[PDB]
Every structure is written in C-alpha cells, then in structure tokens.
Design an enzyme around this catalytic site. Structure first.
Site, PDB file in Angstrom:
ATOM      1  CD  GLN A  85      24.310 -33.472 -47.650  1.00 11.83           C
ATOM      2  OE1 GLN A  85      25.040 -34.306 -47.109  1.00 11.83           O
ATOM      3  NE2 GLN A  85      24.520 -32.165 -47.547  1.00 11.83           N
ATOM      4  CE1 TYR A  87      15.286 -28.196 -47.900  1.00 16.70           C
ATOM      5  CE2 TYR A  87      14.995 -30.301 -49.036  1.00 16.70           C
ATOM      6  CZ  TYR A  87      15.257 -28.934 -49.068  1.00 16.70           C
ATOM      7  OH  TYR A  87      15.466 -28.310 -50.274  1.00 16.70           O
ATOM      8  CB  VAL A  92      16.575 -37.951 -47.859  1.00 20.47           C
ATOM      9  CG1 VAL A  92      18.093 -38.121 -47.790  1.00 20.47           C
ATOM     10  CG2 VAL A  92      15.878 -38.617 -46.704  1.00 20.47           C
ATOM     11  CB  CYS A  93      18.598 -33.493 -50.736  1.00 15.39           C
ATOM     12  SG  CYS A  93      17.386 -32.320 -50.161  1.00 15.39           S
ATOM     13  CG  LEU A  94      20.670 -39.543 -53.267  1.00 17.14           C
ATOM     14  CD1 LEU A  94      21.786 -39.181 -52.292  1.00 17.14           C
ATOM     15  CD2 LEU A  94      20.127 -40.937 -52.957  1.00 17.14           C
TER      16      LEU A  94
END
Lengths: 157, 157
Positions: A85, A87, A92-94
């Site tokens: 998660q 890149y 960060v992806c959440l």
C-alpha cells in the site's frame, strides 16, 4: 488563506504534545526564519511489537493543504518503504486518507499515524499501490516477510 | 502513404499497414524511447489496432518488437517504470496522477502475449505482469480469451 488549517494544526500540535502513543513522533518542521511550519510535519512510526516490523522506526512526512481539514494530509514515507500500500514515491494509501472515501475533517493525526502503523503488518491487498511488494506478497509470503524483516532491521533506531 | 504521427493520433489497422513494409522500424525510430511514458503510449496505440488477421497481426507484432527492443536495450531505460505505467494505463494498477484507462484491452493483451516470448523481454517483469493480469478486474474479465492466452504464455516464461 491557510488560517483555518493553521488554527486546527496548532491545536493538534498541543493535543499531540499532551498525549500520544509511545515511540511515535510527530513534529512540525521549521521555516527558514525559525518559526514553525504547521503545514509540514516530520513523523516517525514504530513497528508493532510481535510483528516482522518490530524494532524499526519508519520516518514519514505529513503535508497539509491550505484547505485542511476539508482535505486529508498527504503522508509519504521517507525513504519509500517496501509495502503493498505504499507507492514507489513513498505515498501511503489508507481509506481515512482519501477525501472521497473515509476522510472526515475530524480525523486526528494520532488516528492517522495509528492507522498507518496498523496497515504495516495488515496490508489491504485488494488495491495495491506498488507492483513489486504486491507481487512478492502474493507469490511467496515467506520471501515477503523476509524482505519486511530486513527492512525493519535497516530502519532500526 | 501515411506517417507515424498521424497513425499515433488516430490509430487504425489500415493506417498501420499504410506506413509501409518498414512500419516496424518507423514506429521505433519516431518514438522517444528515453521516456517510459511515451513508450507506454506508443505500445498501447500500436496494440490497439491488433486484429487476428495475418497482415495486421504481423504488422502489430513487428512494431511492438522494434519499439520494445529499442526501449529495453537502453541500459538507462527503466523497465520497472515502463511496466508500472503500462499497468496504470491499462487500468490494472492505481496511480497518484489522473489517467483515463484505455477502453479495450484485447489488443494490449495480445501484443503482450507476443512480447513476453521474445529474447529482448526482461524475464524479471513476468511475475509482476502475471500478478496484475490474474488479479480480478472487469476489463480483463470481458477479454477472457486474450487474458487466458497471455497467462498461459506467462506460465512458460
């Protein structure tokens, strides 16, 4: 016209300084003139004990836009981390960090940092942010955990 | 007679064939292979005209080979970036920047089927491709034949 964001961030700083999870770091950067830059924070998230991330201290930057808290801050690991998660850029992806998903002006910095810490050992593999970590996680779990442990040791304080 | 720019602007099987018997060389010659994003664009535009018909199939395959050989054989070309951006433009991997995924994956999948069987193809990219082509996605599900074919081929890399 960042006045509203600055008012909120000043309070978030006060709250964080009063009480925050042990091992975590979240501090506003400084402008050249010495004053605080509440729109750019330098943070650190400790790996969860009992997980392959234990012992590591992962640095990240939190960037707030002028329209905060209408928008979530952008969080980027520096340097970029090996994780499905995250890149290649480090972002960060959440769900709570997406304006069109679970972000709510009320979400706190503590909630975000704890959310990212949780994400570390419990990757949501449905929609990965990087092909490398996702591929390894899916094809060889033992190798994936092996790379995670090496990375945790690399960033051990 | 046709030219490369006109073909890339409005791709069609007919325009590809009108480029002449040296069309493969021309596509590679006129593409700035030092830029992964431009190579992805050329690859997708060329593969978009793939048809399971002798003259067109050969023309598309030859063009892809000329283009990708040129790109991959540059020791400076970042093959990982190419794969990542390819997956993004095919709508199989998310990105931080906005990109409108292509509508039909038939040609791209058939072109890839051919590409991964060539000597110039970096085998290290196969697992990543396999991971994202096997991953659930409606666009791929509607291109079952091409998708199954590519996966069967990837198993042999």
């Amino acid at each position: 016209m960042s006045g509203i964001a600055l008012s909120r961030l000043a309070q978030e700083r006060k709250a964080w300084r009063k009480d925050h999870p042990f091992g975590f770091v979240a501090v506003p950067t400084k402008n050249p003139d010495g004053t605080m830059n509440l729109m750019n924070w330098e943070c650190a998230i400790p790996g969860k004990k009992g997980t392959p991330w234990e012992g590591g201290l992962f640095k990240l930057r939190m960037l707030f836009k002028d329209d905060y808290p209408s928008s979530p801050p952008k969080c980027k690991f520096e340097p970029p981390l090996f994780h499905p998660q995250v890149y290649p850029s480090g972002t960060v992806c959440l769900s709570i960090l997406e304006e069109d998903k679970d972000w709510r002006p009320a979400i706190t910095i503590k909630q975000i940092l704890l959310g990212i810490q949780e994400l570390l050992n419990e990757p949501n593999i449905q929609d990965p942010a990087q092909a490398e970590a996702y591929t390894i996680y899916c094809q060889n779990r033992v190798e994936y955990e092996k790379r995670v442990r090496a990375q945790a040791k690399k960033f051990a304080p | 007679p046709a030219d490369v720019s006109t073909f890339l602007a409005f791709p069609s099987p007919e325009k590809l064939l009108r480029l002449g018997p040296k069309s493969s060389v021309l596509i590679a010659q006129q593409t700035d292979t030092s830029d992964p994003e431009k190579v992805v664009s050329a690859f997708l535009k060329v593969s978009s005209v793939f048809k399971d018909e002798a003259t067109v199939r050969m023309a598309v395959q030859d063009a892809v080979d000329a283009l990708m050989q040129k790109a991959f054989n540059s020791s400076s070309f970042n093959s990982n970036t190419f794969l990542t951006r390819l997956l993004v433009h095919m709508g199989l991997l998310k990105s931080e920047d906005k990109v409108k995924a292509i509508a039909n994956l038939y040609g791209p999948l058939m072109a890839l089927n051919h590409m991964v069987q060539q000597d110039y193809f970096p085998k290290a990219l196969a697992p990543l491709l396999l991971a994202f082509v096997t991953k659930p996605n409606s666009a791929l599900e509607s291109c079952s034949f091409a998708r199954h074919s590519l996966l069967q081929t990837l198993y042999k890399v």
